[PDB]
Tab-separated table of C-alpha atoms and ligand atoms in Angstrom:
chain	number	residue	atom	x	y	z
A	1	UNK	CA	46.235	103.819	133.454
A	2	UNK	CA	49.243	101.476	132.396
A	3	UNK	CA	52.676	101.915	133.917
A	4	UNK	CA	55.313	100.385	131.920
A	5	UNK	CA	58.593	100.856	133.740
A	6	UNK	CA	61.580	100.008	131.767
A	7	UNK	CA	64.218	98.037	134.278
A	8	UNK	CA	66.881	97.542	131.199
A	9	UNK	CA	66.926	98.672	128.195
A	10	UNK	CA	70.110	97.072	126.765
A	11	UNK	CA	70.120	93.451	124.913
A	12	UNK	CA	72.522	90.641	125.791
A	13	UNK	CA	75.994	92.045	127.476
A	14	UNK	CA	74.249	95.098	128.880
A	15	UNK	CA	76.124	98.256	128.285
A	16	UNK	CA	78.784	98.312	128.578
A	17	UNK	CA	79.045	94.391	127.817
A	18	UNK	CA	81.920	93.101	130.468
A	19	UNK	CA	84.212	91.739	128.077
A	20	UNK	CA	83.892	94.425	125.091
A	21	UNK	CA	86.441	97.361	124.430
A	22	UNK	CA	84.712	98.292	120.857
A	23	UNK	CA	83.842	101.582	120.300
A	24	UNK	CA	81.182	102.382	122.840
A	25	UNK	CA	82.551	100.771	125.710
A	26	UNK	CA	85.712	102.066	125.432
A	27	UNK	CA	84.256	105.593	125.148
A	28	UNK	CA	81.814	104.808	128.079
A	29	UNK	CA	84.886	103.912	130.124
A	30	UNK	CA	87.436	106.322	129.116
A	31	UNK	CA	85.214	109.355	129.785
A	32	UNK	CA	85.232	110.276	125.693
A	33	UNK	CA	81.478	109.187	125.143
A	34	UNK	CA	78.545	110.871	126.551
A	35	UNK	CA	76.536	107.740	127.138
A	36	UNK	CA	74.351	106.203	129.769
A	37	UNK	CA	74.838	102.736	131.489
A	38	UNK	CA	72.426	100.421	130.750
A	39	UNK	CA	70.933	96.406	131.782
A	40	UNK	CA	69.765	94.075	130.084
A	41	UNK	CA	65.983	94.430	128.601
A	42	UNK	CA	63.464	93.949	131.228
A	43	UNK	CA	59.828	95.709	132.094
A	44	UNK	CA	57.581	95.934	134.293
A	45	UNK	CA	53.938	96.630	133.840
A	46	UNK	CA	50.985	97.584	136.472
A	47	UNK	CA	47.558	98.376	136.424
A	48	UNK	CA	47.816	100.490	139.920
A	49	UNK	CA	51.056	100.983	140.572
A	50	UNK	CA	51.746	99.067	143.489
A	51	UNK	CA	51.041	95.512	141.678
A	52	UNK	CA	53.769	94.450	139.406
A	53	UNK	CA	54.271	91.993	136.405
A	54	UNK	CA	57.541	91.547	135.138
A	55	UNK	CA	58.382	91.111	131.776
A	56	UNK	CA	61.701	89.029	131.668
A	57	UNK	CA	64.037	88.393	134.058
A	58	UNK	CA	67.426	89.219	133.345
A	59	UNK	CA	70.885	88.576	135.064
A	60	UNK	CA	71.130	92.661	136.331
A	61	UNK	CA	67.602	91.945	138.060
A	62	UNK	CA	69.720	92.702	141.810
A	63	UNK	CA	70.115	95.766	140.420
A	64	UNK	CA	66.967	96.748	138.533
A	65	UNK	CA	64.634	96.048	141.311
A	66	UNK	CA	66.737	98.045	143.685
A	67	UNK	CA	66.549	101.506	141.133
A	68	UNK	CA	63.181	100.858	141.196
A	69	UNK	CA	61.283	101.668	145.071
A	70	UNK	CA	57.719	100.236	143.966
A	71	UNK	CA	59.558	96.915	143.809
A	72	UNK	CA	60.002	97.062	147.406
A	73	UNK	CA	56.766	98.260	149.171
A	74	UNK	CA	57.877	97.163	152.591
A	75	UNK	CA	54.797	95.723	154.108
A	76	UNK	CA	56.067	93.426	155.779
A	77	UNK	CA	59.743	91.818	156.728
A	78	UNK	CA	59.847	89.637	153.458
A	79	UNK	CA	57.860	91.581	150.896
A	80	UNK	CA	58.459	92.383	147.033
A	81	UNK	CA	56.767	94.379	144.700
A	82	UNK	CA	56.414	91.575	142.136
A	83	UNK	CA	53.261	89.581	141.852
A	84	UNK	CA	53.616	87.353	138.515
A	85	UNK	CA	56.335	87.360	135.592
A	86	UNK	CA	55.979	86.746	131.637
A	87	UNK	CA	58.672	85.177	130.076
A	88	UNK	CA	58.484	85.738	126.190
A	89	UNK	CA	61.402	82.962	125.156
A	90	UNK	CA	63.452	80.999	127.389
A	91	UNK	CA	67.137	82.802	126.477
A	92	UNK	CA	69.650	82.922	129.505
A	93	UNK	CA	69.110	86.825	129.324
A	94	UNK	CA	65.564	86.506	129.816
A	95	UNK	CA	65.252	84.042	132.857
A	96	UNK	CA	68.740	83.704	134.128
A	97	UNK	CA	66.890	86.650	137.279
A	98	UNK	CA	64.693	83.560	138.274
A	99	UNK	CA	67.184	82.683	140.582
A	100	UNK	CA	67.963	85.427	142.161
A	101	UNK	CA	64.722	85.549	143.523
A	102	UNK	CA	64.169	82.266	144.783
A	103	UNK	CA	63.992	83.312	148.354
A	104	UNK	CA	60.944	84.917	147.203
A	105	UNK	CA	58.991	81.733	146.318
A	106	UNK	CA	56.533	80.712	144.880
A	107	UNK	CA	56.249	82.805	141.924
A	108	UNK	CA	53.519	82.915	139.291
A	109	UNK	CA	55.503	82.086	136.179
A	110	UNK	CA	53.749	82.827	132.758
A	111	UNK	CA	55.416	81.217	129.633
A	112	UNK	CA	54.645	79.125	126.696
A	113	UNK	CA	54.468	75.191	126.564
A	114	UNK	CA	57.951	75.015	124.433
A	115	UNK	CA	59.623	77.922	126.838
A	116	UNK	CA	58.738	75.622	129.896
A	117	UNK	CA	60.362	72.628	127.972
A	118	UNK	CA	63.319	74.694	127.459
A	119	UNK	CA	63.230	75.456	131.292
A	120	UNK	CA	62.587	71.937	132.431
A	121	UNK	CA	65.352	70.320	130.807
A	122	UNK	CA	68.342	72.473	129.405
A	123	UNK	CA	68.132	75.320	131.418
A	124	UNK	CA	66.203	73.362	134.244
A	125	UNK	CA	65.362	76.715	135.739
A	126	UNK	CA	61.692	74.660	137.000
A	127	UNK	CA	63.296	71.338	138.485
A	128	UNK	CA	65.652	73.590	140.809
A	129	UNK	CA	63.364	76.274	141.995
A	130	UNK	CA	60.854	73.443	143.203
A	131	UNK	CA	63.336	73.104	146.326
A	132	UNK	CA	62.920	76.810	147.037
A	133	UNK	CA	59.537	76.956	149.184
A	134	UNK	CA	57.647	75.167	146.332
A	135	UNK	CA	59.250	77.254	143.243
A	136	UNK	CA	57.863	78.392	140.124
A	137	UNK	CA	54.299	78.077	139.247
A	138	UNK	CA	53.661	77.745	135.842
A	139	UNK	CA	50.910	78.844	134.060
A	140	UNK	CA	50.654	78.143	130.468
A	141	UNK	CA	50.775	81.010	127.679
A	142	UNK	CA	48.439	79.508	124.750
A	143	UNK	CA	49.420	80.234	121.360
A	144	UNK	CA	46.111	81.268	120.554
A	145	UNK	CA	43.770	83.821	122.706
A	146	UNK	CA	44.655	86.206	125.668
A	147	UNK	CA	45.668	85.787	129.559
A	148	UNK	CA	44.854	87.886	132.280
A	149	UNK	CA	47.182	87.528	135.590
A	150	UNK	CA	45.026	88.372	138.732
A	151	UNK	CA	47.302	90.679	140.442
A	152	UNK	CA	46.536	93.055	137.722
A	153	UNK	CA	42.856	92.364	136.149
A	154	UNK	CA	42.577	95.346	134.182
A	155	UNK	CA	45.945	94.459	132.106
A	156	UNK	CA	44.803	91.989	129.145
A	157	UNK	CA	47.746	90.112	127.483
A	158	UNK	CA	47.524	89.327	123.941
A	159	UNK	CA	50.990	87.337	122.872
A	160	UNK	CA	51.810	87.107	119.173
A	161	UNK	CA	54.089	84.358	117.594
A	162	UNK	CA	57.593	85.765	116.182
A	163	UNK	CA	59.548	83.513	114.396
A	164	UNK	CA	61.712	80.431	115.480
A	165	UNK	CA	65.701	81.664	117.696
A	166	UNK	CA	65.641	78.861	120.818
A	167	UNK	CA	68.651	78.976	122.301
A	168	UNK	CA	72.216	76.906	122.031
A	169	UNK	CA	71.265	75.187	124.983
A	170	UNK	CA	67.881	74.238	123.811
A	171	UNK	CA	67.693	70.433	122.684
A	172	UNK	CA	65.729	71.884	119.588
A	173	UNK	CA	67.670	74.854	118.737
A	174	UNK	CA	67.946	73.355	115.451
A	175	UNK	CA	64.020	72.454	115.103
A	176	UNK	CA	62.326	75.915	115.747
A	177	UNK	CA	58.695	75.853	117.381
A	178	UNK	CA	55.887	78.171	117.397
A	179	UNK	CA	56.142	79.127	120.789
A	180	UNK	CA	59.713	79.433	121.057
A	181	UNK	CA	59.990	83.362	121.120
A	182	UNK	CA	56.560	86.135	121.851
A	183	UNK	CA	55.383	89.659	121.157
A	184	UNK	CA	53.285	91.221	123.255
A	185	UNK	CA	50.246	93.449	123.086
A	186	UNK	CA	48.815	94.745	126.237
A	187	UNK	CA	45.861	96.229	126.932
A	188	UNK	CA	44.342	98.410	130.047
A	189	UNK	CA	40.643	97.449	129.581
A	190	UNK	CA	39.487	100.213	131.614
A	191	UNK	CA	40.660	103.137	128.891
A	192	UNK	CA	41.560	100.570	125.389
A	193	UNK	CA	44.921	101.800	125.556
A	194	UNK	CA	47.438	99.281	124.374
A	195	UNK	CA	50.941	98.865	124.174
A	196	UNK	CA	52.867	96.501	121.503
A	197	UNK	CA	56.305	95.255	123.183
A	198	UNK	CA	58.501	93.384	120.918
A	199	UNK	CA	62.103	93.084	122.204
A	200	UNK	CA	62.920	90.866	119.544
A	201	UNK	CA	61.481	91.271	116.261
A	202	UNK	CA	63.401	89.730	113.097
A	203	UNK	CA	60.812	90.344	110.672
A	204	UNK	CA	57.742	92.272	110.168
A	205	UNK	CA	54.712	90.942	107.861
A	206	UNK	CA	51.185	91.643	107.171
A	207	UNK	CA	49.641	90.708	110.716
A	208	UNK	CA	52.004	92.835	112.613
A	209	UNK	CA	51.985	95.815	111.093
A	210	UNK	CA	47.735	95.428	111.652
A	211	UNK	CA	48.350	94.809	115.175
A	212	UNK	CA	50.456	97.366	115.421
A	213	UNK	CA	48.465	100.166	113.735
A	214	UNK	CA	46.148	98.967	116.886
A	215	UNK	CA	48.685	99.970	119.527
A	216	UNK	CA	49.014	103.203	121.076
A	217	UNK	CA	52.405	102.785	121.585
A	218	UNK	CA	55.048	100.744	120.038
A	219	UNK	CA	58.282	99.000	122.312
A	220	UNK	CA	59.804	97.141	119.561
A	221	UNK	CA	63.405	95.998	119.145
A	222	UNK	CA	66.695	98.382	118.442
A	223	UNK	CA	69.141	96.479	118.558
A	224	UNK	CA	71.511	96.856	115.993
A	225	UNK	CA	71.618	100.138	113.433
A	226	UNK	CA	73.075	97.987	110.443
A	227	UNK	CA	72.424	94.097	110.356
A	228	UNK	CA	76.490	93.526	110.090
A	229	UNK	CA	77.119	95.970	113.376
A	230	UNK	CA	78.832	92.951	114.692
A	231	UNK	CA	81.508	93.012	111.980
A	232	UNK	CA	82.117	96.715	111.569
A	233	UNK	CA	82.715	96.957	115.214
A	234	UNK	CA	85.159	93.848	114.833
A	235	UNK	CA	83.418	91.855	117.831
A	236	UNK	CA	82.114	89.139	116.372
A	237	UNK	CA	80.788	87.591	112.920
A	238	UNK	CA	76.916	87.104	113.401
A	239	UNK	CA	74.549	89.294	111.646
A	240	UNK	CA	71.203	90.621	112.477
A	241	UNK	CA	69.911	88.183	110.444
A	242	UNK	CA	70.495	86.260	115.749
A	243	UNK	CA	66.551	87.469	114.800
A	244	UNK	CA	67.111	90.964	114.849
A	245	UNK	CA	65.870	93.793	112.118
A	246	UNK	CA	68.521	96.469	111.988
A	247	UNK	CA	67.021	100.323	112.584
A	248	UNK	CA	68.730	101.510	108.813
A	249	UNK	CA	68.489	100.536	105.292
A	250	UNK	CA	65.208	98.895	103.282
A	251	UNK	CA	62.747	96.899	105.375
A	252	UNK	CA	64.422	98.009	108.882
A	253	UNK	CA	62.823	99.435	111.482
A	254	UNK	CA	62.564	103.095	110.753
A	255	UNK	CA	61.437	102.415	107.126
A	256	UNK	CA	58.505	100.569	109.181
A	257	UNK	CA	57.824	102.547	111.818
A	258	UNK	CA	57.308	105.193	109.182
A	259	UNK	CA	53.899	104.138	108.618
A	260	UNK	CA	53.029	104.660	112.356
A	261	UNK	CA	52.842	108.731	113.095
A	262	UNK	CA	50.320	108.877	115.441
A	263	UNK	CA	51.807	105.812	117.780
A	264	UNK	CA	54.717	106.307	120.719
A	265	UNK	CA	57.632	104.852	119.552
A	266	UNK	CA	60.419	103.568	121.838
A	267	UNK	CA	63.490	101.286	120.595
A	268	UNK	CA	64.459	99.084	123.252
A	269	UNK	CA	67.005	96.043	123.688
A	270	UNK	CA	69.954	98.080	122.538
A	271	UNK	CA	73.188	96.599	121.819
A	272	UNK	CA	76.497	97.637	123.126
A	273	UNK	CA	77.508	98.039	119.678
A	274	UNK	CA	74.936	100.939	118.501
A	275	UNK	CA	75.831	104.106	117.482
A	276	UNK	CA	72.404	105.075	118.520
A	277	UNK	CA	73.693	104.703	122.552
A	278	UNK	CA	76.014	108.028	121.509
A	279	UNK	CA	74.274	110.733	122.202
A	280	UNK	CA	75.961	112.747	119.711
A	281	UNK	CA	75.694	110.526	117.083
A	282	UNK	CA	73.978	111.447	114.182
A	283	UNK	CA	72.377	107.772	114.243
A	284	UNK	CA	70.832	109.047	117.236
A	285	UNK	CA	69.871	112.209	115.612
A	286	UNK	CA	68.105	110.726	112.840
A	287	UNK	CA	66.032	108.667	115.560
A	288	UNK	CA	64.893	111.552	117.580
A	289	UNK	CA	64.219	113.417	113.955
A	290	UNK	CA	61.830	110.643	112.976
A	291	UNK	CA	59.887	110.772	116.261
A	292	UNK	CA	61.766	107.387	118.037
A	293	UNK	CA	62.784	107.680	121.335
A	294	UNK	CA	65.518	105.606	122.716
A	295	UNK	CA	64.598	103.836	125.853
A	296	UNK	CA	66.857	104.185	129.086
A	297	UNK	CA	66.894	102.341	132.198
A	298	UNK	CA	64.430	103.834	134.404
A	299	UNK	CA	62.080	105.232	131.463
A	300	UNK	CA	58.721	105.457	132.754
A	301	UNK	CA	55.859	105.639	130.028
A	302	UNK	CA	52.451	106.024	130.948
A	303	UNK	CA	49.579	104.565	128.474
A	304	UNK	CA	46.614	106.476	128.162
B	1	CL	CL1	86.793	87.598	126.318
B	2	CL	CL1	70.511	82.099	125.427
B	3	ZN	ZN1	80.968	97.074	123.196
């Protein structure tokens, strides 16, 4: 058995995002939209159920690990339900939660060799935790290969390379490294079950969609319907492209996931901005019509 235990299913800004009055958050806040509340994209994954990797760590992690009681097991005064994380890129959604749980150290820190350059120098997320009872210990993600964490032997992690997106702060933000952002498969060696988790997914080739036929069940990226959701919402002027591949139109999501009947599929890392968060939307229709569920903060799947 896998557990996969969604924490937050939204992407950057959460929803509703603080400073946004577009259509959704407005509606969320005046009462006019039936809509859920949601934090930013996080899992958690076990083997047992009681041992507990996490899968990002975002700024609502306060929150997420208090929703969720296996997080605290109670077995002693200072106890937590975490035994390892997995950091897939080294975005300020993704790790900013590190710090929130330095009086928790040490903490088995998976990531890549660029992702810990990243968090050694611009967001020196490594260099400050080392003063919290002997911080963050890394061990290295290889780009080539699979990892198994201890605290959960029967969980086999095979990371695949998506393309290029370090962040602003990143001293190569403008000279993109394999390395720099992950996909996920994960697989329960006991029953070959596997999941694919890609929160952020900008473009889907040959090798993926091999991988993916492998998977049982597919956690891939939903955050925007159209690639200029941005614009139409008037909230900003980026477009999908950020990394993301929009849910509608030729060579988006749906279109893939199309070729993938037999698979679970969940869209996850949801912007404040999609009409798929409206649950009378028919953008969310069309989703549940083509067999995609939309992930929620305190989904539980079970794999196999
Ligand atoms: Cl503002
Ligand atoms: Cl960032
Ligand atoms: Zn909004």
């Amino acid at each position: 058995m896998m557990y996969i235990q969604v924490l937050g299913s939204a992407a950057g800004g959460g929803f509703p995002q603080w400073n946004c009055n577009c259509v959704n958050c407005k509606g969320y806040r005046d009462g006019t939209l039936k809509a859920t509340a949601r934090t930013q994209s996080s899992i958690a994954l076990s083997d047992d159920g009681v041992h507990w990797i996490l899968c990002n760590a975002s700024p609502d992690i306060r929150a997420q690990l208090q929703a969720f009681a296996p997080m605290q097991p109670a077995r002693a005064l200072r106890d937590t339900g975490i035994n390892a994380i997995v950091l897939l890129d080294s975005q300020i959604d993704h790790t900013t939660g590190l710090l929130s749980l330095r009086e928790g150290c040490p903490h088995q820190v998976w990531c890549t060799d660029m992702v810990h350059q990243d968090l050694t120098t611009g967001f020196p997320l490594f260099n400050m935790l080392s003063h919290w009872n002997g911080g963050l210990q890394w061990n290295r993600i290889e780009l080539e290969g699979s990892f198994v964490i201890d605290a959960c032997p029967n969980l086999k992690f095979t990371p695949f390379p998506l393309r290029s997106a370090a962040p602003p702060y990143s001293p190569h933000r403008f000279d993109p490294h394999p390395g720099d952002n992950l996909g996920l498969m994960v697989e329960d060696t006991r029953t070959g079950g596997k999941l694919f988790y890609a929160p952020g997914l900008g473009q889907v080739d040959e090798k993926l969609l091999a991988m993916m036929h492998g998977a049982d069940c597919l956690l891939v990226d939903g955050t925007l319907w159209e690639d200029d959701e941005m614009q139409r919402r008037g909230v900003g002027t980026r477009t999908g492209r950020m990394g993301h591949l929009a849910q509608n139109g030729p060579g988006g999501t749906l279109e893939v996931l199309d070729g993938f009947p037999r698979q679970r599929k969940v869209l996850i890392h949801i912007n404040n901005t999609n009409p798929i968060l409206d649950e009378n939307s028919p953008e969310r229709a069309e989703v549940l019509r083509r067999g995609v569920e939309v992930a929620f903060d305190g989904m539980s799947i079970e794999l196999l």
